[PDB]
Design a protein around this ligand. Structure first.
Ligand SMILES: COc1ccc2c(c1)O[C@@](O)(C(F)(F)C(F)(F)F)CC2=O
Ligand SMILES: COc1ccc2c(c1)O[C@@](O)(C(F)(F)C(F)(F)F)CC2=O
Ligand SMILES: COc1ccc2c(c1)O[C@@](O)(C(F)(F)C(F)(F)F)CC2=O
Ligand SMILES: COc1ccc2c(c1)O[C@@](O)(C(F)(F)C(F)(F)F)CC2=O
Ligand SMILES: COc1ccc2c(c1)O[C@@](O)(C(F)(F)C(F)(F)F)CC2=O
Lengths: 284, 281, 285, 288, 282
């Protein structure tokens, strides 16, 4: 005989909802040092991919390439070489903050996690991610002399990129930074939701690539990425300060990101579902 | 290596389409609208991102020697993720629904009043979602302000020029472009049901949506979002130019393209395969 | 875990090809006609999109430097979705049919009268679909018309130039390009018959169609659509240079490319194996 | 309930060797005038894809595009639109020559095919590939009037691509030619290994695309490809000759491709997997 | 009636660690001489892909093209055509030291390999990869005259690129080469993790594609690839020195890669999954 058997991998929509709920749920039943270590590893990963993307962008940000291109090439290159951090953060079993919002709030609305454990888990995750991102920004990004200031305009195509992008991220307004943050985190949550319903290698890679590339080229603001880039911009002595980092950009970035995760995608999805989840709860 | 087959076409894709179509008549009027507004918010997300991405390539000195060639390409290349967000989420856009629920109606699965109410709730909710994302995320962040300069105002000018180009078509031209758009879109919604493969999923929908974007076709929800955010950011267009010159012809076109240009053909070809499938089952 | 596989190629591909050709014999006359017109308008839609993208990359100050490099490249990159459309919905083009139904006739799985019937029906339908879409969505949509300016006439200049370059071949040249085109097309059909997977389908045919587009070969229905819209929009050609000087050669080239270039050899190769398969299906039940 | 079953798309490692030796073993049973038809088809496919690649490159080889860029974009486009030939040959069951050296000499190494039969399969495959390649280069690529010289500066971008690429091929040395040849085959043979280990379509298309795109952009000399391009360049009356095409370049790349197929890689693989193939063959003694 | 099978091509997390440590353990029973053959094969494979990438990147290093882009397209094409070395190595079963560091050390940690076996396995891997890389850098690369100093500036790019690249693979100070090395190895070990835990051919190709491309375009430092690059740059008589080649890059690149493998991706991941593995092996 020669007849094959059918097969399918996109088993989702109303089941990826249950996968999200449980994945967020038993993320709480780990050890404090376990969450700590996963968070620090994810921060290191974000630092790595952001250094890589910055070097590529500053490569395409040459002196005579701006005079015509005007940062079209540089941003496209950054948005092309950044969307790989997701793979290293997922396949190593790590956990980042931006996706913890969606997952863990889903698991809390269903009353599977206690809200104190919610506090513990997500403060640990955010603190660890900051710790890892800044540790990488200093150990492998700054002692590597990559983004330093070479006072000649010919070679400075690396300093001016990490200077311009930073001082552009700073000078938004509170409202603007918040809206860009909510946009970024909605894209991030959607990329996280992809994985639970594709269950396909190419599905994984290409779906999250498209999502994160859209976020990156879009101009939205990610808290972990912002943490890394602004810390390193401070370390290589660009023209921003500490105030414009953890107040004028960072405070808004976290507020809007959490709003997008817990409120924008939280209550609509919880209203659609929670009555499809009931039957799955009834099962033995 | 046992031989596996991750594709079926023709008859079976039609069965899946008609079943997904007659499904949505059983949802409550609340979660249906909830789903519709989420689809709108996602198309707004992706349209905003792709718009700023295309405006990036619309530089003052690039436009001189490329003449908007690269901007439209990056728009088309950045948009097509919206398909993935909606299908994965469990939501629905009115364009996709057209083909689905009209095929069910033809089959005798959805009643008439249920058909009217599903499709109207879908259109209304999608408008709500698009026009609310247009304000709360894109107007407040100020990404499209008329930065009164020549070498910093590309994100405004790209949106301004595309929104102007989208209004000056005469009636029949807007109708025809919308017809083509919905043909593309319903073909993509068909691909998704035909091949149940993540790689095939993302790439089939990406190619379909890219060909739909770069071709100058008119999409009703994307038009809603873009034209609203071009009214907010104070470009050259009159409310009348956006809502009666553009939106009405493109809605005419999208519905017609989904319901009769590709619904009666596909229902006359496979009229009785569905009969037999329901017989022995 | 458990190991799997998708691509079952070689003999299995030939058996699938000959039986997928066989099947078309019994679809009623109305049934093939409908599917024909549908595939025609699909190829028309995708070609319209392709030409619009190409013209977009045909600006005034662009050709003054790069000539036509980006134009043809983006054209060929935008076209390949028509195959996915036709294979997903289940319609047929003449280009796909040549190989399939000749290979089906060779095994005497078909009749000759029904072979003539299915071929004529498919060609008539594809022509009707291509010209209907060329009139109703390309010329009423006034997208290719000649806005007599220089800096915004890309979408008429591109179409004018490709039509002019296609009508200007000697008989043997158009025939040669046509056989090249249909060779690529039926190899793509063989690809989807042997892959049985999603990404395989998509990218396999993408590369095949892109290669036959960028090369400048001659597809008969693509040429129907493009030359008929060029006649509508009134570029600088005539009815001759489309129907007689370009379309008869490409029709004959495509037919012989499907019928004899590949289809006479592969029959000779796997005749014994399909005989074995038929005898085995008769051995079991 | 939901519980998707885990699969594995690649059974690689110590097994692709078994599959490759089995493939090369079974290939040598077909018939005399059957291998002929398969080889002629493979040559036709190589010619088709090389013609498309040449047209694409010459397109991107415009006059002012040369003066700005320096003939870098045309090479990239050629390398991008070449790789389809592998899928053509694979799905149609046809076999090129370069593929055989890595497969059928490995088969013979284990003492599966006789010696005589090995030599005859080699010669039949190469003769058929040659005849098919030059048949396509005459009947579809010369009668097309595509690469015809124009005697004009802004339309000659196809003739110029063909001319200069051939003229850069011919000015090699024997040592240089054989080194470029061995590099190319090493690429081709690893692509064959790819195909016979990774299933699932994307492994069938993308791996081989990347491999032979590297082979194309890298400047490595391919035997069948060189056959096609130099024969058609001669047909079009470029600056190339008959002895700079056949003896000076064609023979060194032929010998180098064979060397890289049967000695560079194929001997170490055999040294590694002797025992694994022995313990594999240890099964059907009493398993059946 | 329609009823496909719910497939799942990817099963990662704890399974990834399980597979990586069992593979790192299994690679230490290889007869003391299969390891060397596989390592030399890996060396020649890296040489293959790096030669091809050098030619590709040099093609975009034109004189005139260089005046505008200034190396943006060169490095991009180089990184775009390098990453096939990963696939070509894994599909045959070779032995790469820089990737062996994580897998091989982890297995050491969990008491699956021993001290002397770990020692000798990785010294074999070192020597074999080096032999393969230098052999390929001489026989096929130096002999095919593709990199000679054709002293006309219009055609010399295939030399200049190589030259220029080597020129700025040396002049870092110590700690700078160490940091770039740490980053590169971290990348390649995560690529190994990817290719191990995502069991699909599609991901097989594309995960490692993105990983190695991002490693390459980022100016990081491999040790096998740097061995090939600097050897062949010596053979052509560019503006470098064997002392700068060895005591200024190789010394720094190998140390940094080893630190990135066995201490920054092997001690964390061993503190994470130390119990999930035990509860699995009994
Ligand atoms: C499933 O694992 C997660 C969970 C959450 C995130 C993640 C992975 O990856 C991000 O970092 C990213 F997608 F934005 C990246 F691309 F930058 F990596 C953001 C994020 O919240
Ligand atoms: C799976 O359900 C549907 C139903 C309908 C649509 C859809 C999904 O995806 C779209 O939204 C889209 F992604 F293709 C867009 F780009 F056009 F927005 C179009 C559309 O109408
Ligand atoms: C699988 O069934 C077929 C049957 C026939 C054809 C086909 C598929 O694919 C085409 O549509 C195409 F994609 F190659 C196009 F570009 F020419 F349109 C042409 C064609 O003959
Ligand atoms: C039957 O399977 C084979 C056998 C051998 C070859 C093949 C497939 O495909 C190639 O033609 C190629 F595509 F890799 C090319 F690019 F080198 F042409 C090389 C080659 O000899
Ligand atoms: C699966 O087996 C391995 C093991 C290790 C590596 C590898 C494969 O692939 C590399 O060779 C590479 F591709 F990343 C290179 F390009 F950097 F060389 C490096 C590396 O560590």
């Amino acid at each position: 005989v020669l007849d094959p058997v059918s097969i399918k991998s996109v088993c989702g929509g109303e089941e990826s909802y249950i996968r999200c709920v449980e994945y967020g749920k038993k993320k709480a039943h780990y050890s404090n040092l376990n969450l700590l270590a996963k968070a620090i590893l994810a921060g290191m990963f974000v630092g790595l991919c952001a250094h890589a993307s910055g070097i590529a962008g500053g490569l395409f940000y040459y002196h005579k390439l701006r005079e015509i291109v005007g940062a079209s090439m540089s941003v496209f290159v950054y948005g092309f070489t950044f969307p790989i951090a997701f793979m290293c953060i997922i396949c190593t079993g790590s956990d980042l903050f931006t996706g913890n919002t969606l997952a863990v709030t889903m698991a809390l609305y269903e009353k599977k996690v206690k809200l104190l454990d919610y506090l513990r888990v997500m403060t640990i995750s955010l603190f660890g991610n900051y710790v890892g991102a800044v540790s990488f920004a200093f150990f492998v990004s700054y002692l590597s002399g990559a983004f330093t200031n070479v006072h000649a305009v010919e070679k400075n195509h690396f300093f001016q990129f990490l200077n311009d992008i930073a001082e552009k991220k700073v000078h938004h307004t509170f409202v603007e930074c918040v809206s860009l943050a909510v946009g970024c985190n909605i894209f991030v949550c959607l990329a996280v939701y992809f994985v639970l319903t594709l269950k396909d290698g190419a599905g994984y890679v290409f779906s999250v690539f498209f999502a994160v590339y859209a976020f990156a080229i879009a101009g939205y603001e990610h808290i972990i990425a912002n943490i890394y880039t602004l810390n390193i911009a401070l370390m290589v002595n660009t023209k921003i300060t500490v105030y414009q980092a953890y107040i004028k950009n960072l405070l808004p970035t976290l507020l809007g990101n959490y709003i997008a995760g817990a409120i924008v995608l939280g209550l609509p999805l919880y209203f659609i579902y929670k009555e499809h989840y009931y039957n799955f709860e009834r099962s033995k």
